[PDB]
C-alpha cells in the first residue's frame, strides 16, 4: 500500500521532467537550451515538479554541474527553496550535492549562501524499515554518513552546528553509530571530536542523550555495534603500569554499571530485541564485570533462593499427598464408575492431630503463594509459570473454604507447575544452564510448528478408526468406543506409548488391518522420526553456542536479583576512586598478559 | 578476596607516587625537578612506597633512563634495596630493568655492582594460578624467560650462577620448559648449555632434579611440552647407519623406561591431570616402547588374567543359582504375599552330595574375594568395582554363617558387579577398548548432568498422577496405588518401557487424559530425545579420538601389570648395552624410511 503509492510518485516525477523543457534541459547536460529557455519572458522558473522539486534540484540530482551554474545566475533565489512534498519535505539542493559528493557544486551553493542548518524533515529520511538510508536531517549529517571528509571540513567552516539534533534527538555522533559501514564510521567519529572546541555549553558531545536517554556509548551497545563499542571504550581505560609482558589496565564502569535507578548498559542489552546486542557481553570490561557479580554476590543468593524453593515445594507436595479423603457416601451409578473415595467437608477435615500438622503445612503454602503475588505481579517464560502456580494454590484455597468438588484439577496443575519451576534454578550451573534453552526452542520452535501436521494425521485416522469399530463390541477392543477416546488412543498409538489394538479371539473388521498398517507407516515410522530429527538439529545449534547462551542467563538473573533484593546486601562492584585520588567513579582493574 | 586485596594495593601505589614529588618526577621523565629536589636537605631519599618501592624502582619500572641515572649519582645505595612488601618481596631494580629489557640501564646497575644473585621471593612470582607469569627468582631466570639473549650473555659474565634453584627447586632449565612460547625456549635452552663449562660439581645441568625429583627431560613430558620433548630427545638418539633411504637410529630409554622402583616417564604421564601430557605417548621412542611391552609381555598376561576371571564369575554364578531354598514354613499374611520359598538354615543347608559340590564352589569364590582384598586394597573406576564386589561376597559369607534373612540383596549386587567387571578386560582388544570410555563419559557426563532435570519432571507428574487416582479403585489401574510405586511407574513411563495405563471398561478420571497427554509430550518425546542426542555427541567425540584413547589404556594397564606381577616373569625392554660396548644402558633400535 505504502510502496505502491511511492512507486507511482517516482514515475510521476520522470513524466513531469520529460514534459517540461526547462527540467528536461537540466536532467540532460543541455546548456544550449537553458540559454534559450531562460531568455524568454517569465520562463516559468518557479514551476513545481511532482516531488516538490525545482529546476536546480534536478541539475543537482543528476550531477549536472554546467546546467546547475547557469540556473544560479539566472535565478539566484532557487538556492533557498526546499522540496514541498510529503516524502521529501525540507530537502534543499545543498543536501543533494552533499549526498552525491559533487565537490565543485557544494562550493558554488555556499558561495550563494545556502543555509547549512536546513532540516530534511520528509518521510524518506526517517529511521524506518521503509527507508534504505538514515542519514539524519542536516547537511553535516549527510556528509558524515557518505564518508566525505572534505565536505565535512568545508561546511563546518561555513557554520554548521555540530551539536544539532533531529526529530529522534540524535546528534551527528548517534547517526554514525547507526551506519552499516562500521569501519569508516570510526575514522569519522574522531574527526567530529577534533571539533567541539567551543565553550562546551552543556556536557561534551559524546555525552549528549537523544530522546530515549542514550548517549553514543550506550547506543553502540544497544544496537550491537561492536566495532564502535571497542573504539569508544578506549577513552575509558587507563593503563597503570607495564611490567614486561604484563599490563594493569583500569576501566571506568560509569555507564556500564548501574549508578542509581537509571538504566545501565547491562539492563538495556537484556531488554532489547537485537541478537547483535548480546555480542557486547564478550567485551573486556563487560566480560569481567559479569563474572564478578556472579561469583561473589550472585551465585550465593541464587543457590539460597533455590533451596528455599525446594523446601517450599516439598511442603506443598506433602499437603497434597495427605489431603482429606473419606469413603464414598453414594452408591455406584454404572459399572463404569470406578471412584470409591471422596473428599471431606471443611468441618470434618481438621479433627485430629495429624490434621493440625497439615494445617501448618497448608498455611505455609498459602503464605508463599501470596509473597509470589507481591514480588512478581505488581511489576520470560518462568515469569508466567510462577504466577500461574501462585493462582492455582489460591484457586484451591477457595475450594477448600467454600466446599467444592474437584480440587484435584487445581492441584494437578499446581504440582507439575510447582515442580517444573525448579528448572529455573538450573542456570546457576554452567553444565545445566542451556538445557532449558533446548527445551524452550524445541517446544516453541519445533513442536508448535509441526503439531499442525500431526493434528491433521491424528484427526484423519481417529475418525477412520472410530467408524471401523462403530458396529463392533467394545468389550473386546474398546480403544475407540466413543469419539474423544478414539482421539486419545490415536495420539498414543502415534507416539508408540500403548500397544496396537488386537484381540486374536474375534474377527476384527477388514478395514482395520489396512488402515492400521497405513497408520503405523506414516505416523510411527515417518512423521515421528521427522520430529526427532528436527529436534536433533535444535539440540546441535544450542549446544554449539553453549557458553554465550549461559552468560546471557547470568546477566538477566543478576539484573533481576539486584532490583528486587534491598541495596544493603548488594555491594557495588569495583573500587571507589575517592580515597585513591581518581574521582567519584568506580573502577575495575584488569591485569592481562600479551 | 585475594584479588580484591591485590587491586587495592595497585591503586594505593599510584596514589603514593602521585603524592610524593620525588616519585612523581621519576614516573615522568622529569630530570628538571630531580635536580631541584635532590639539592634540598635530606630530601626523603629513602622514603618508602605502597609496594615497598623506592624512587629508583619507579624510574626502572616506567623505562625512564634519564631519571634513573640522576638518582644513582645522588644516592648510590638505592641499587642495593629490595622491595619490602609481601607481594613483591626481594625484587630489586636489577630485576625490573631485566624484565623491561632496558639494555642501557642494566649496564648502569652492573657498573654500580648490583647483585645478580638476589632472590625475588614475593608472592607475585610464585608458580600459581593467581599469577600470569612465572619467571623464577634470579635475574638470569628473568632474562631467559623474556627471550633476551644479550642480557643473559651480559650477566653470566658478571657472575650469575647458572645452577641456581628457587623455592620449588627449579633451575633455569626447568623454568624455560614452563614458558608459554615454546619455540623461543628451544633456542634459549641451547644457549644455557653452551655455558656450564665449569668443573661440573654435581651431575650436569640437564640432570639436576627439582624438589619433586623431575629432571628437565621428565618435566617436559609431565607438563605436556611436546616441542621441548623432541628437542631434548635428540641428545639421546644415536644414528648407526644410513643405507640409502634407511636409517637405523638407536634410542636411549634411560629416563623413559623404569629402572628400579623410581617413577619413570610412563608412570608420570598416566598419574597426572594434564590432558596435554598424553601427547607424549605418540612420540618416536615412546610409541615404539609401548607396542613392545604390549605385544610381547602385556597382551599374553592380560588375556590370561581375563580368562581366569571368567572362570571365577561362572563359578560364583552357579553357586548363586543353586543356593539352598526350602518351602515356606509360615502361612500367607495378606493376599499381596507372593513369596512361597525360603532360604535354609546353616545346619540343613549342607546335607547331600550336591551340597558338597556347591561347598567347593563356594570356597573358591570366598578365597578369590580375599585375594582381591590383598592385591588391591593394601595399596580408576574399575578399582572401586572390584573392591565393592569383594565386599559383597564377604557380606554374604557372614550372612550364611550367622543365619540372616536377606542374602538376595548382597548377592544381587555381587552378580551385576562381578559380571560387569568383565568390561575391564575389553581394553585388550583395540576394537572394544574405547567402548568403555563411551559408557563412562555418558554416565558421568551426560546422565549425571541431566538426571537433575528428569527428577524434577518425574516428581512433578508422579505426584499429579498419584492424587488423580487417589480416590479410585486400584484393582483396575493399580499403577499409582501408593507413592513409591507412583514414582517407579512414572520413571518407567518416561523411558517408555511399560505401556501407558488404560482400562477402557471403567471411566478414568478427567484429569488423567490431560495430564498423561502433557506427560507423554514433555517426557517421552522431548526430554527423552534430548538425552539420546546428548549421548550421540559423546559417542562422536570419543570415536573420533579412538586410537589415542586406546593407547592410554594400554600404558595404564602395562604399568599396573608390571608393578604387581613379580619381576622374574617381566623382562626388561630393549637390548642391554654391556656386551655390545655401549655402556650399562638399555637401547631401543628403530629403523625407519624417509
Ligand atoms: C534442600 C533439599 C531437601 C532434600 C530432601 C529433604 C526432605 C525430603 C523428605 C521429607 C519428609 C519425608 C516424608 C516421610 C513421611 C512421614 C512424615 C510424617 O510423619 O507425616 C505425618 C503427617 O505429615 C503431614 O501431614 C505433612 C503435611 C505438612 C508437612 C510440613 C509441615 C511443617 C512445615 C513448616 C516448614 C516447611 C519448610 C519451610 C519452607 C521454607 C504422618 O504421615 P505417616 O502416616 O507417618 O506416613 C506413613 C504412610 N504409610 C504408612 C502408608 C507408609
Ligand atoms: C572361558 C569361558 C568358558 C565358556 C563356558 C564354559 C562353562 C559354562 C557352563 C558351565 C556348566 C553349565 C551348568 C549346567 C548344569 C548342570 C551342572 C550340575 O551338574 O549341577 C549340579 C550341582 O552343581 C552345583 O551345585 C554347582 C555349584 C558349584 C559349581 C562349581 C564347582 C567346582 C568349582 C571348582 C573350579 C571352578 C573354576 C576355577 C576358578 C578359576 C546339579 O545340577 P542339576 O540338578 O543337574 O541341574 C538341572 C536343573 N533342572 C533340572 C531344573 C534343569
Ligand atoms: C532442574 C533443576 C536442576 C538443579 C536444581 C537446583 C535447585 C536447588 C538449587 C540449589 C540448592 C543448593 C546448591 C546445590 C549445590 C551446593 C553448592 C554448589 O556447589 O553450588 C554452587 C556453589 O554454591 C556456593 O556458593 C557454595 C558456598 C555457600 C554459599 C551459599 C550456598 C547455598 C547452599 C544452601 C544454603 C541455603 C540456606 C537455606 C537452607 C535450606 C556451584 O555453582 P557453579 O560454580 O556455578 O557450578 C558450575 C560448575 N558445574 C556445573 C560444572 C558444577
Ligand atoms: C494453564 C496451564 C499452563 C499455563 C502456563 C503455560 C503456558 C505456556 C508457557 C509460557 C508462555 C508465555 C511465553 C511465550 C513462549 C516463550 C517462547 C518465546 O519467547 O517466543 C516464542 C513465541 O511464543 C509463542 O509461540 C506463543 C505461545 C503459543 C502457545 C501458548 C499456550 C500453549 C501452552 C504450551 C504447552 C507446551 C506443550 C508441551 C506439553 C503440553 C518463539 O519461540 P522461541 O523460544 O523464542 O525460539 C525458538 C524458535 N527457533 C527454534 C526457531 C529458534
Ligand atoms: C492443534 C490442536 C488440535 C487437536 C485435535 C483434537 C482437538 C479436539 C479437542 C476436544 C474435542 C472433544 C471435546 C470433549 C466433549 C465431547 C464432544 C465431542 O467432541 O464428541 C462428541 C461427538 O461430536 C463430534 O464428533 C465432534 C467432533 C467433530 C469432528 C472434529 C472436528 C474438530 C477439530 C477441528 C480442528 C481443526 C484444526 C487442526 C488442523 C489445522 C461425542 O462423541 P460420541 O460420544 O461418540 O457421540 C457420537 C453420537 N453417536 C453415538 C450417535 C454416534
Ligand atoms: C495396505 C497398506 C497400504 C495401504 C494403501 C492403501 C491401498 C488399499 C488397497 C486395497 C483396499 C480395498 C479393499 C477391497 C474391499 C474388499 C471387501 C471386504 O470386505 O473384504 C473381503 C475380503 O477381501 C480381501 O480379503 C481382499 C484381499 C486383498 C485386500 C487388499 C490388500 C492390499 C495389498 C497392499 C500391497 C502393498 C501396497 C502398499 C505398499 C507400501 C471380506 O473379507 P472378510 O474376512 O469377510 O472381512 C470382513 C469382516 N467384517 C465384516 C467384520 C468387516
Ligand atoms: C565386555 C568384555 C568383552 C571381551 C571379553 C573379555 C573377557 C575374556 C578375556 C580373555 C579371554 C581369552 C582371550 C579371548 C580371545 C582369544 C585370543 C585372542 O585372540 O586375543 C588376543 C590375542 O591373545 C593372545 O595372545 C593369544 C596367544 C595365547 C596367549 C594367552 C591367551 C589366553 C587364552 C586362554 C589361556 C588362559 C589360561 C587359563 C585357562 C582358561 C588378541 O588381542 P588383539 O590382537 O589386541 O585384538 C585386536 C584385534 N581385534 C579387536 C580386531 C580382534
Ligand atoms: C554400591 C554399588 C555401586 C558401587 C560402585 C559404583 C560407584 C560409581 C563407580 C565409580 C565412582 C568413582 C569414580 C568417579 C567417576 C569416574 C569418572 C571420572 O573420573 O571423573 C568424573 C567425575 O566423577 C564424578 O562425577 C563423581 C561421581 C558422582 C556419583 C558417584 C556415585 C553414583 C553411582 C553411579 C551410578 C551409575 C548410574 C547408572 C545406573 C544406576 C567426570 O566424568 P569423566 O568420565 O571424567 O568425563 C566425562 C565428562 N565429559 C563428558 C564432559 C567429557
Ligand atoms: C536425582 C535423585 C532424585 C530422585 C527422585 C526421587 C527420589 C525419591 C527416593 C526415594 C523416596 C521413597 C523412599 C521409600 C520409603 C517411602 C517413604 C516415601 O517417600 O513416601 C511416603 C509418603 O511420604 C512422602 O510423600 C515423601 C515424598 C515427599 C516429596 C518428595 C521429596 C523428596 C525429593 C526431593 C529431592 C529434590 C532433588 C531433585 C531436584 C533437584 C509413603 O507413601 P504412601 O504409602 O503413599 O503414604 C501416604 C499416606 N496416605 C495414605 C495418607 C496418603
Ligand atoms: C491437553 C494437552 C495439553 C495440556 C496443556 C494444559 C491445558 C489445560 C486445558 C484445560 C484443562 C481445564 C479442565 C476444565 C475443568 C473441567 C471439569 C471436569 O471435571 O470435566 C467435565 C467435562 O469437561 C470437559 O470435558 C471440557 C472439555 C475439554 C476441555 C479441555 C480440553 C483441552 C484442549 C487442548 C487443545 C490443545 C492445546 C495444547 C496444544 C499442544 C466433567 O467431565 P466428566 O466426564 O464427568 O469427568 C469427570 C470424571 N471424574 C469425576 C472421575 C473426575
Ligand atoms: C512462607 C515462606 C517460608 C515461603 C517461602 C516462599 C519462597 C519459596 C518464595 C517467595 C518469593 C519467591 C521468589 C519470588 C520471585 C522470583 C523471581 C522469579 O524470576 C523469574 O520469574 C525470572 C525468570 C525469567 O524471566 O526467565 C523466579 C522465582 C523467584 C526467585 C521466587 C522463588 C521462590 C520464592 C523465594
Ligand atoms: C581361588 C582362585 C582360583 C580364584 C582366582 C581369583 C582371580 C579370578 C582374581 C584374583 C586376583 C584378581 C585380580 C586382582 C586385581 C586386579 C587389578 C584390577 O585393576 C584395576 O582395578 C585397574 C582398573 C582401572 O584403574 O581402570 C583389575 C582386576 C584384577 C586384574 C583382578 C582380576 C581377577 C583376579 C586374577
Ligand atoms: C543391582 C543393581 C542395583 C546394581 C547397580 C549397578 C551399577 C551401579 C553398575 C553396573 C554397571 C556399572 C558400570 C559398568 C561400566 C562402567 C564403565 C567404566 O569405564 C571406565 O572406567 C573406562 C575407563 C578407561 O578405560 O579409561 C566406569 C564404570 C562404569 C560406568 C560402571 C559404573 C557402575 C555400574 C553402572
Ligand atoms: Ca507394550
Cell readout for B49 is 612506597
Contacts of B67 (CB under 8 A, 6+ apart): B25, B26, B28, B29, B30, B31, B34, B59
Contact indicator for A238, A249 with CB cutoff of 8 Å: yes
Q: Which of residues 494-523 of B touch A (CB under 8 A)?
A: 496, 499-500, 502-511, 513, 515, 517-518, 520-522
Q: What does the angle CA B159 – CA B164 – CA B170 come to, to the nearest 5 degrees?
A: 150
How far apart are alpha carbons A446 and B551 in whole angstroms?
Answer: 42
Cell readout for B425 is 578386560
CA distances from B294 to B160, B287, B553, B561 (A): 48, 11, 11, 11
How far apart are alpha carbons A503 and A448 in whole angstroms?
Answer: 36
Give B130's contacts in chain A (Cβ within 8 Å).
none
Classify burial at A182, counting beta carbons within 10 Å of its beta carbon; exposed 0-12, middle 13-18, buried 19 or more. Answer: middle
Cell readout for A356 is 493440625
Give B572's DSSP letter: P
How far apart are alpha carbons A155 and A116 in whole angstroms?
Answer: 7
Distance of CA A563 to the CA centre of its chain: 21
How far apart are alpha carbons A390 and A165 in whole angstroms?
Answer: 48
Contact indicator for B447, B438 with CB cutoff of 8 Å: no
> Long-range CB contacts (< 8 A, 24+ apart) of A3-10?
A3/A130, A6/A87, A9/A50, A9/A51, A9/A85, A9/A87
User: Phi, psi (5° rounding) for residue A591?
Assistant: -110, 125
Distance of CA B115 to the CA centre of its chain: 40
Classify burial at A586, counting beta carbons within 10 Å of its beta carbon; exposed 0-12, middle 13-18, buried 19 or more. Answer: buried
CA distances from B293 to B32, B86, B248, B297, B302 (A): 74, 51, 21, 6, 12
With residue B82 as reference, give the H or E element that holds it: none
How far apart are alpha carbons A51 and A86 in whole angstroms?
Answer: 8
* Residue in chain A nearest B57 by alpha carbon: A243
CA distances from A354 to A277, A316, B149 (A): 56, 16, 84
Distance of CA A110 to the CA centre of its chain: 44
With residue B103 as reference, give the H or E element that holds it: helix B103-111
Contact indicator for A348, A326 with CB cutoff of 8 Å: yes
How far apart are alpha carbons B477 and B508 in whole angstroms?
Answer: 9
To which residue does cell 587491586 refer?
B7
Determine contact: B333 vs chain A, CB below 8 A: no
User: Phi, psi (5° rounding) for residue A239?
Assistant: -80, 125
Closest CB from A338, A581, A582 relative to B476: A338
How far apart are alpha carbons B142 and B585 in whole angstroms?
Answer: 36
To which residue does cell 467394545 refer?
A474
Closest Cα partner for B324 from B357, B341, B347, B349?
B349
Q: Residues A179, A184, A189, A192: is their CA dihedral positive or negative?
A: negative
Contact indicator for A472, A526 with CB cutoff of 8 Å: no
Contact indicator for B162, B192 with CB cutoff of 8 Å: yes
Classify burial at B594, counting beta carbons within 10 Å of its beta carbon; exposed 0-12, middle 13-18, buried 19 or more. Answer: exposed
Strands (E), B100-199: none
Closest CB from A492, A589, A593 relative to B132: A593
- Dihedral Cα A51, A52, A55, A58, nearest 10 deg: -30
* A246: β partners: A593
With residue A337 as reference, give the H or E element that holds it: none
User: How many CB atoms lie under 10 A from the CB of residue A329?
Assistant: 6
Closest CB from B61, B459, B483 relative to A419: B459
How far apart are alpha carbons A141 and A138 in whole angstroms?
Answer: 5
**CB atoms A339 and B521 under 8 Å:** no
Contact indicator for A292, A571 with CB cutoff of 8 Å: no
Helices marked H in A238-380 — which ranges? 265-270, 287-292, 299-321, 353-375
Closest Cα partner for B452 from A554, A434, A306, A426?
A426
Contact indicator for B98, B148 with CB cutoff of 8 Å: yes
Our separate counts of H helices and E strands in chain A read 25, 6
What is the Cβ-side half-sphere exposure of residue A404, based on CA atoms within 13 angstroms? 13
How far apart are alpha carbons B27 and B68 in whole angstroms?
Answer: 10
Distance of CA A337 to the CA centre of its chain: 52
Determine contact: A333 vs chain B, CB below 8 A: no
Contact indicator for A147, A180 with CB cutoff of 8 Å: no
Closest Cα partner for A161 from A192, A117, A97?
A117
**CB atoms B502 and A498 under 8 Å:** yes
Rg, C-alpha atoms of chain B: 36
Cell readout for B60 is 626502572
To which residue does cell 626502572 refer?
B60
Determine contact: B405 vs chain A, CB below 8 A: no
Contacts of A82 (CB under 8 A, 6+ apart): A52, A89, A90, A91, A92, A118
Contact indicator for A311, A425 with CB cutoff of 8 Å: no
User: How many CB atoms lie under 10 A from the CB of residue A198?
Assistant: 10
Determine contact: A465 vs chain B, CB below 8 A: no
Contact indicator for A407, A362 with CB cutoff of 8 Å: no
User: How many CB atoms lie under 10 A from the CB of residue A519?
Assistant: 21
Give B502's contacts in chain A (Cβ within 8 Å).
498
* End-to-end alpha carbon distance in chain B: 58
How far apart are alpha carbons A492 and A529 in whole angstroms?
Answer: 15
Contacts of B501 (CB under 8 A, 6+ apart): B477, B479, B480, B489, B516
Distance of CA A303 to the CA centre of its chain: 28
Residue B443 beta carbon below 6 angstroms from any ligand 4 atom? no
Closest Cα partner for B150 from B98, B199, B108?
B98
Contacts of B208 (CB under 8 A, 6+ apart): B163, B165, B171, B173, B202, B215
Give B471's contacts in chain A (Cβ within 8 Å).
325, 339-343, 408
How far apart are alpha carbons B219 and B172 in whole angstroms?
Answer: 13
Q: Residues A259, A260, A262, A265: is their CA dihedral positive or negative?
A: positive
How far apart are alpha carbons B577 and B573 in whole angstroms?
Answer: 12
Buried b (16+ CB within 10 A) or exposed e, A338-376: bbeeebbeeeebeeeeeeeebeebbeebeebbeebeeee
Q: What does the angle CA A356 – CA A361 – CA A363 come to, to the nearest 5 degrees?
A: 95
To which residue does cell 494425521 refer?
A457
Going by their DSSP bridges, the two strands B246-251 and B239-242 should be labelled as antiparallel
3-state secondary structure B3-41: HHHHHHHHHHHHHHHHHCHHHHHHHCCCHHHHHHHHCCC
Contact indicator for A278, A269 with CB cutoff of 8 Å: yes
How far apart are alpha carbons A398 and A24 in whole angstroms?
Answer: 82
Contact indicator for A469, A480 with CB cutoff of 8 Å: yes
**CB atoms A416 and B530 under 8 Å:** no
Closest Cα partner for B494 from B456, B444, B537?
B456
Contact indicator for A174, A210 with CB cutoff of 8 Å: yes
Contact indicator for A65, A97 with CB cutoff of 8 Å: no
How far apart are alpha carbons B68 and B78 in whole angstroms?
Answer: 10
**Which of A308, A417, A433 to probe ligand 11 with, by most ligand atoms within 8 A of CB?**
A308
How far apart are alpha carbons B73 and B32 in whole angstroms?
Answer: 15
Indicate the SS3 state at residue A495: coil
How far apart are alpha carbons A332 and A59 in whole angstroms?
Answer: 96
Q: Which of residues 253-292 of A touch B (CB under 8 A)?
A: none
Amino acid at each position: 500500500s505504502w510502496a505502491q503509492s511511492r512507486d507511482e510518485q517516482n514515475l510521476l516525477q520522470q513524466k513531469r521532467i520529460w514534459e517540461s523543457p526547462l527540467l528536461l534541459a537540466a536532467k540532460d547536460n543541455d546548456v544550449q537550451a537553458l540559454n534559450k529557455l531562460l531568455k524568454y519572458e517569465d520562463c516559468k522558473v518557479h514551476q513545481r515538479g511532482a516531488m516538490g522539486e525545482t529546476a536546480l534540484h534536478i541539475a543537482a540530482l543528476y550531477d549536472n554541474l554546467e546546467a546547475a551554474m547557469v540556473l544560479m545566475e539566472a535565478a539566484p533565489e532557487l538556492v533557498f527553496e526546499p522540496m514541498t512534498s510529503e516524502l521529501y519535505e525540507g530537502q534543499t539542493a545543498l543536501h543533494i550535492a552533499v549526498v552525491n559528493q559533487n565537490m565543485n557544486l557544494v562550493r558554488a551553493l555556499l558561495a550563494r549562501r545556502a543555509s547549512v542548518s536546513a532540516r530534511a524533515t520528509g518521510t524518506a529520511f526517517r529511521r524506518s524499515p521503509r527507508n534504505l538510508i538514515y542519514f539524519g536531517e542536516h547537511p553535516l549529517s549527510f556528509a558524515a554518513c557518505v564518508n566525505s571528509e572534505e565536505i565535512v571540513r568545508l561546511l563546518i567552516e561555513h557554520g554548521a552546528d555540530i551539536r544539532a539534533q533531529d526529530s529522534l534527538g540524535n546528534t551527528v555522533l548517534h547517526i554514525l553509530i547507526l551506519q552499516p559501514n562500521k569501519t569508516f564510521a570510526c575514522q569519522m567519529y574522531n574527526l567530529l571530536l577534533s571539533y567541539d572546541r567551543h565553550g562546551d555549553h552543556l556536557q561534551p558531545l559524546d555525552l549528549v542523550p537523544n530522546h530515549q536517554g542514550l548517549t553514543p556509548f550506550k547506543l553502540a551497545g544497544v544496537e550491537g555495534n561492536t566495532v564502535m563499542f571497542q573504539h569508544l571504550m578506549q577513552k575509558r581505560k587507563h593503563t597503570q603500569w607495564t611490567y614486561g609482558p604484563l599490563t594493569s589496565t583500569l576501566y571506568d564502569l560509569t555507564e556500564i554499571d548501574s549508578s542509581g535507578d537509571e538504566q545501565s548498559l547491562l539492563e538495556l542489552i537484556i531488554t532489547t530485541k537485537k541478537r547483535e546486542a548480546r555480542q557486547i557481553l564478550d567485551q573486556t570490561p563487560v566480560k569481567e564485570l559479569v563474572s564478578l557479580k556472579w561469583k561473589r554476590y550472585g551465585r550465593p543468593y541464587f543457590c539460597m533462593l533455590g533451596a528455599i524453593y525446594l523446601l517450599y515445594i516439598i511442603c506443598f507436595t506433602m499437603c497434597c499427598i495427605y489431603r482429606p479423603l473419606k469413603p464414598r457416601t453414594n452408591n455406584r451409578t454404572s459399572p463404569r464408575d470406578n471412584t470409591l473415595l471422596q473428599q471431606k467437608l471443611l468441618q470434618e477435615a481438621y479433627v485430629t492431630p495429624k490434621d493440625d500438622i497439615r494445617l501448618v503445612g497448608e498455611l505455609v503454602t498459602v503464605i508463599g503463594a501470596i509473597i509470589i503475588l507481591l514480588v512478581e505481579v505488581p511489576d520470560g517464560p518462568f515469569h508466567v509459570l510462577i504466577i500461574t502456580y501462585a493462582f492455582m494454590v489460591l484457586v484451591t484455597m477457595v475450594m477448600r473454604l467454600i466446599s467444592a468438588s474437584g480440587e484435584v484439577v487445581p492441584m494437578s496443575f499446581a504440582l507439575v507447575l510447582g515442580w517444573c519451576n525448579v528448572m529455573y534454578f538450573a542456570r546457576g550451573f554452567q553444565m545445566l544452564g542451556p538445557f532449558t534453552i533446548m527445551i524452550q526452542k524445541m517446544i516453541f520452535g519445533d513442536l508448535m510448528r509441526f503439531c499442525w501436521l500431526m493434528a491433521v494425521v491424528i484427526l484423519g485416522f481417529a475418525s477412520a478408526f472410530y467408524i471401523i469399530f462403530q458396529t463392533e463390541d467394545p468389550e473386546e477392543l474398546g480403544h475407540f468406543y466413543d469419539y474423544p477416546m478414539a482421539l486419545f488412543s490415536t495420539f498414543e498409538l502415534f507416539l508408540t506409548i500403548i500397544d496396537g489394538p488386537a484381540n486374536y479371539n474375534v474377527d476384527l473388521p477388514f478395514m482395520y488391518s489396512i488402515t492400521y498398517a497405513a497408520f503405523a507407516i506414516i505416523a510411527t515410522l515417518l512423521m515421528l522420526n521427522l520430529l526427532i530429527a528436527m529436534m536433533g538439529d535444535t539440540h546441535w545449534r544450542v549446544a554449539h553456542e553453549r557458553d554465550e547462551l549461559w552468560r546471557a542467563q547470568i546477566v538477566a538473573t543478576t539484573v533481576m536479583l539486584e532490583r528486587k533484593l534491598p541495596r544493603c546486601l548488594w555491594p557495588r562492584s569495583g573500587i571507589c576512586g575517592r580515597e585513591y585520588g581518581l574521582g567519584d567513579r568506580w573502577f575495575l582493574r584488569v591485569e592481562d598478559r600479551q
